[PDB]
């Protein structure tokens, strides 16, 4: 059934699956032709799928080639997602495929659900949560990467750095869905708190800085009060 | 013209034969149905007084024997026989018609209904549906699952429709997975129609029994069923012209059969919104649109 407040912890259990998150697959910008008419253009975008527990990251790179001559794109963008994903469980080893694959919106289901039509024993799972996967493009070395693709390309990341080195997944975790969730509501801020110390650097191999443990507290006490003041401002309380 | 006797009516009941039905009370002198028009299927049902759940009744065709009604008091309801001795039948049917204890099959001569609804309709589909070949008739409840209904007990009491799923290894071809969720064409004309039914007056059929079964038994699996053979058609893109006009009649006197007080249950809102306005074949079915619109425009 459908993931939320509940039934959270399953995440951290030794049943592997995957997130996957289709929102920046078919990205635009939006602007007007010489009659005034307006027109879209694609830029490249990314399938997110992440496995909560260990942190791996296969970033899918959509180039905006695979759009070309397509009607109904967001539409397509649902099968392209479902039709990519599919193909990635294809390529992992049985024991590596995984049991759960939840989908962040729902209208993901039935395409996915068709991709994987053969794979009956993989239970397709939509999400009562506000997930703020979204955000992806707002980590610098992802979002660099998907822009700079010159073709399709699947790009691999640990999204957790070295945090399980020393914290549980279901910190790691909820440190990465607050960190998103603040890139998500107010990017500028977020960034701002991230790099404000030049000393505290990004390794080549990592995503985000080599915080110490305190650190990461002052941080994550920046990120949260960030989300509420953002929240007063949206809704005047 | 054919002729159904039963030889009592021991309990009150309800009985039905095809879209007409009569109240019999227990132990009225009651013998038997006359002037059953020949040559189509029918259909005889029953509701006793006291039990209004189990609704149950025969799909038979006069031209493949003489049947009769019986009462057994040990199973508790009314039963389909057939009789062999052609002479011995004759004889009871006579005699019954000469103290005129028998109903008329209460036909209107300018009414097509019942041909409508079961124009495509054939005793030899339904026996394969209702497999139990010791009868030449066919034994249908209220309570009868299908074959896809057990999927997810007693296979011997299944009704064998065929099965349909949109989301399965039969309705899809590898690499046409978005064409064909979308466009069920393939699975419309190439595995059903070419492939299972052979051509479009088989797939029909079990179309119309399965809402007939629906309609006289609140069977709920035949009306799953008959929505499922309704949506497969209004999700194909490309449907032989004469399928789709033949559909329009074919539904327009099932609507318009159904007793208005059953919408409720026995109309899928999803698949009928879908098929009138929001599939490929919206605009190729007008009559059939007209009639909802003008009867249930709550549903929609
Ligand atoms: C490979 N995608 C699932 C699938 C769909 C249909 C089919 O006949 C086989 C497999």
């Not at chain 1, 879209?40 to 959509?62: Q, R």
């Not at chain 1, 939840?102 to 939509?126: G, Q």
């Not at chain 2, 949109?166 to 595995?191: C, Q, W």
């Amino acid at each position: 059934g459908a993931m939320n407040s509940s039934n959270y912890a399953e995440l951290f259990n030794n049943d592997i699956k995957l997130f996957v998150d289709d929102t920046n697959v078919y990205r635009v910008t939006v602007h007007k032709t010489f009659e005034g008419n307006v027109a879209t253009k694609a830029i490249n975008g990314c399938i997110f799928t992440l496995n909560p527990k260990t942190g791996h990251l296969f970033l899918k790179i959509i180039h905006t080639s695979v759009w070309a001559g397509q009607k109904r794109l967001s539409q397509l963008a649902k099968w392209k997602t479902a039709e990519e994903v599919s193909a990635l469980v294809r390529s992992l080893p049985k024991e590596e495929q995984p049991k759960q694959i939840i989908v962040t919106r729902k209208a993901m289901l039935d395409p996915l659900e068709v991709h994987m039509l053969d794979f009956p024993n993989i239970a397709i799972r939509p999400t009562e949560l506000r997930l703020p996967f979204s955000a992806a493009m707002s980590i610098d070395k992802l979002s660099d990467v998907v822009m700079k693709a010159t073709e399709p390309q699947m790009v691999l990341f640990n999204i957790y750095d070295d945090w399980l080195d020393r914290i549980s997944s279901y910190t790691a975790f909820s440190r990465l869905t607050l960190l998103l969730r603040a890139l998500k509501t107010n990017e500028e801020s977020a960034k701002m708190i991230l790099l404000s110390d030049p000393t505290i650097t990004i390794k080549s191999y990592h995503l985000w800085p080599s915080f110490t443990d305190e650190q990461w507290i002052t941080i994550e006490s920046q990120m949260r009060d960030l989300i509420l003041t953002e929240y007063g401002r949206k809704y005047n309380v | 013209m054919n002729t159904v006797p039963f030889t009592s009516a021991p309990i009150e009941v309800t009985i039905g034969i095809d879209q007409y039905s009569f109240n019999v009370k227990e132990n009225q002198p009651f013998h038997g149905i006359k002037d059953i028009p020949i040559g189509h299927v029918h259909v005889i049902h029953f509701q006793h007084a006291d039990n209004s759940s189990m609704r149950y009744g025969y799909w038979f065709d006069c031209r493949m024997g003489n049947f009769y009604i019986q009462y057994d008091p040990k199973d508790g309801l009314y039963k389909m026989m057939e009789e062999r001795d052609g002479a011995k039948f004759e004889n009871i049917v006579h005699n019954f018609k000469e103290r005129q204890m028998m109903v008329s099959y209460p036909k209107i001569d300018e009414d097509d209904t019942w041909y409508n609804l079961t124009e495509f309709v054939q005793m030899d589909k339904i026996r394969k549906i209702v497999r139990k070949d010791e009868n030449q008739f066919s034994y249908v409840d209220s309570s009868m699952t299908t074959v896809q209904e057990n999927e997810l007990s007693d296979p011997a009491h299944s009704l064998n429709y065929t099965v349909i799923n949109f989301k399965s290894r039969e309705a899809i071809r590898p690499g046409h997975e978005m064409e064909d969720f979308l466009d069920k064409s393939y699975y419309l004309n190439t595995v059903m129609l070419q492939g299972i039914f052979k051509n479009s007056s088989n797939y029909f059929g079990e179309l119309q029994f399965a809402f007939l079964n629906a309609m006289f038994f609140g069977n709920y699996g035949s009306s799953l069923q008959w929505h499922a053979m309704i949506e497969l058609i209004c999700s194909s893109a490309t449907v032989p012209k004469h399928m789709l006009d033949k559909l329009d009649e074919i539904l327009y006197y099932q609507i318009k059969t159904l007793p208005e007080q059953y919408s409720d249950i026995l109309l899928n809102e999803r698949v009928w919104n879908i098929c009138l306005y929001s599939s490929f074949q919206k605009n190729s079915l007008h009559n059939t649109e007209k009639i909802m619109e003008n009867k249930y425009p709550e549903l929609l």
